[PDB]
Design a protein around this ligand. Structure first.
Ligand code: XS6
Ligand code: XS6
Ligand code: K
Ligand code: K
Ligand code: NH4
Ligand code: NH4
Ligand code: ZN
Ligand code: ZN
Lengths: 341, 341
C-alpha cells in the first residue's frame, strides 16, 4: 500500500495556539507526522513517496477563490500591518452581521475563519499546498486502479469549509481528493470521517451536492469542537438531500458503541452507491487523546480498517487529527493493517 | 450636571486582551475611569454620586435572557473546567452553522461572543451590572426632568448585542438607558453613537424596532472593528425601517468632515422626533487614540457637545471607549463643557 507524504508539511511549524485563554505551543505540530511516518514504516508500509506538486485546478472546485487568495497572502499582509504575534482572528461574522467582505487583514482573517485557536504562520500556505498534493496523488492512485492508499496529510483538512479555515485546517484535503476522483471519472464518491471531531468543513463543502456522500462519527457538538455543526438532524439540502449522515456520540464512547455507528454509516454509503470511499482518518478517538473524549483502544483501529475495507470498494485514507502521544502512529498503522489484511 | 459613577467598575480588571496575535494588557483598563473622573471634576463637574443598584427588569427588554444567564456564570464555569487563562472564545457560529446552543462552557462562550479580543475575568459580571446601574440612574434623572447627565460607565456597552459580548462590552448600557426612558414614559428616543467604532451591539438591539432611532458615526467597517456591521446601506428592518443611520468615514477624518456627519445625524434624529438623546460617547475619535484612525482635537469635543445639546432635547451622555492617554479625561470633560455651556 503506497504512502504519499511530503516533507514540506514542516513548513507549518506554528509557534502558538490559543487554548484555555493562553497562547501555547500547538497540538498539531510537526512531530505528529514524524511519529505517524515511523509507525507506518515499522508496520511494513515502506512504499513512501513524495507527491508531485499540483496547482489549483481541483481545489477551486471545492474552495472559494477569494478564500484561497486570502490564504496565499495572509501571512505577508499580517506582518506588513505591523502585528507582532502570529495571525489570529478576533472578530467574526456571527449572528445578524453584514455579508460584506472587509478590505484589511484584520477584518479579512475573521471573515475567512471559523475558529481562532488556529494561527496562520509563515510557511502555512506552502505546507497546506503540499498536504493537498499528497491527497491528490493518493486519489490519482485510486483512480488508476489501486484499492487502497494512504495520504499522510499535514496540516489536516476536515474543518476547512468552502471559505473558512480553523481547527488546524486550511485546505480540505479529503474534499479535494473526492473531487479529484470525480474529475478522473467517478460519478459517486463518499467521504467517511472517523476523526473524533465533526468534519464541519467537509460537510459544508458538499452539503448541497449529491455527488459526494458525507458521513461523520464524532463527539456530540453540544459538548465538543467544532460546536456549531454535526447534529444528526443535518441530512442535506437541495441536490444534497439525504447525503449527509452525522453520528454524534457522548463522553466515554467505546468501540462497542462507536462500531455500531460505523456499521450504519457503511450501510448508508453502500445504499448511496459510492464508487470509492475517502476516509478522513483522525486517531483522536483514542482513549489517551489529550483533547477528546472517546475510548477506542489500539486494537480497535485494526477492526475499524477491516470493517471499512469490507465495503469492497477502493479506499483512500487521508490523515486528519490525533495528538499528544507517539501511539498516534501505532493507531494509524493499525487502520492500515486492517485495510491491507 | 450630575455624574453617576460606581467604584465597582474596578471589579473588571482583566489581565489579558488578544491583540496582534499576542496576549497583552487590556486597553479598557480601570485607570481609564480614574482619568475621566479626575478630569470631569477638574472641569467643575463635581456632583458625583454612586448609582443605586438595579435588578434585571430593564435589561431583559434589550438583552436575551439566556445571554444574561450565561454571563452570570461564565467565569465560574470556565475556572471549573480547568482552564488556566482568562475566558476567551475561539469557536464561533459563523456562515452556514447550526443555530443550536451548545451546552458546555467552550461552546457557549463562542455562541455568546462576537469578538475574541475580550476576555471574561473574575468580577466582570458584577462590574457590568454596576455600569448598567450607572446608565439606569442617569436615565432616571433625564426621565425626572434633567436636561443633561453623565453616566461614567465602565465597562462600556455599545458592542454588546442582543445575545453577544465583545469589543470590551457585556451589557449595552446605552440600550438599557434608552429602554429605561421608554419605560418611564417616552414614546421615541434616539441613541447617537459618537465613539470611533460602530455601535453594532446597539444597532442589533434596535434594528427591528421603531421606538429607538440609532445613529452612529464611525470608522468604515471595511477597515475598522467591528468589521461586520456599520455600512451606510443598513437602514433597518420591519418596524425598524428607516431608523438606523450609519455614517462610516475613512482614515484621518478630521472634525471638518466628521462634524458634517454629526449635523446630518441630528437632522435625522429631529425628524424622527426623539424626546431625548442617549449619547454613546467614546473619545477614541481623538488624534492620539492608540487603536483608532480619526483626527479630532481636544477643542473639537467642546464643539461636539454644544452641537448635540443645541438639538434642544435632554441628553444622557453614556461613556464608551477612548484609550491610552490621560487626555481621554479632558476630551470627555470638554464634551460636558459643550453641553453645559
Ligand atoms: N478542550 C478543548 C480542546 C481543544 N479544542 C479546539 C481544538 C480543535 C481540534 C481540531 C481537531 O483536532 N480536529 O480534528
Ligand atoms: N488594530 C486592532 C485594534 C484593536 N481592535 C479591536 C479592539 C476593540 C475596540 C473596541 C472599542 O474600543 N470600542 O469602542
Ligand atoms: K468525524
Ligand atoms: K460610533
Ligand atoms: N453531500
Ligand atoms: N431602530
Ligand atoms: Zn479531530
Ligand atoms: Zn470605540
Amino acid at each position: 500500500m503506497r504512502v504519499i507524504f511530503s516533507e514540506d508539511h514542516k513548513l507549518r511549524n506554528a509557534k502558538t495556539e490559543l487554548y484555555g485563554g493562553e497562547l501555547v505551543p500547538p497540538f498539531e505540530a510537526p512531530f505528529r507526522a514524524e511519529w505517524i511516518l515511523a509507525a507506518v514504516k515499522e508496520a511494513g508500509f515502506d512504499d513512501v513517496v513524495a507527491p508531485a506538486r499540483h496547482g489549483l485546478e481541483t481545489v477551486l472546485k471545492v474552495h472559494d477563490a477569494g478564500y484561497l487568495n486570502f490564504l496565499e497572502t495572509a501571512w505577508d499582509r499580517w506582518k506588513a500591518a505591523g502585528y507582532k504575534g502570529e495571525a489570529i482572528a478576533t472578530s467574526f461574522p456571527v449572528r445578524r452581521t453584514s455579508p460584506r467582505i472587509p478590505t484589511d487583514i484584520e477584518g479579512q482573517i475573521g471573515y475567512y475563519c471559523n475558529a481562532a485557536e488556529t494561527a496562520i504562520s509563515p510557511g502555512t500556505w506552502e505546507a497546506a499546498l503540499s498536504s493537498m498534493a499528497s491527497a491528490i496523488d493518493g486519489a490519482d492512485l485510486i483512480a488508476a486502479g489501486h484499492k487502497a492508499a494512504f495520504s499522510l496529510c499535514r496540516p489536516p483538512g476536515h474543518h476547512a469549509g468552502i471559505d473558512m479555515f480553523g481547527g488546524y485546517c486550511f485546505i480540505n484535503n479529503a474534499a479535494v481528493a473526492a473531487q479529484r476522483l470525480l474529475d478522473k471519472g467517478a460519478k459517486k464518491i463518499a467521504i467517511l470521517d472517523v476523526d473524533f471531531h465533526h468534519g464541519n468543513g467537509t460537510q459544508d463543502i458538499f452539503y448541497e451536492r449529491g455527488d459526494v456522500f458525507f458521513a461523520s462519527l464524532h463527539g456530540d457538538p453540544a459538548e465538543a469542537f467544532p460546536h456549531f455543526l454535526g447534529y444528526a438532524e443535518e441530512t442535506g439540502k437541495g441536490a444534497g438531500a439525504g447525503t449527509t449522515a452525522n453520528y454524534p456520540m457522548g463522553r466515554g464512547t467505546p468501540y462497542s458503541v462507536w462500531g455500531e455507528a460505523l456499521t450504519d454509516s457503511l450501510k448508508r454509503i453502500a445504499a448511496f452507491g459510492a464508487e470509492a470511499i475517502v476516509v478522513s482518518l483522525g486517531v483522536d478517538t483514542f482513549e489517551q487523546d489529550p483533547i477528546s473524549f472517546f475510548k477506542l483502544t489500539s486494537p480497535d483501529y485494526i477492526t475499524m480498517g477491516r470493517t471499512i475495507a469490507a465495503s469492497g470498494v477502493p479506499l483512500l485514507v487521508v490523515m486528519e487529527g490525533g495528538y499528544g502521544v507517539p501511539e498516534i502512529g501505532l493507531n494509524v498503522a493499525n487502520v492500515l493493517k486492517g485495510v491491507a489484511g
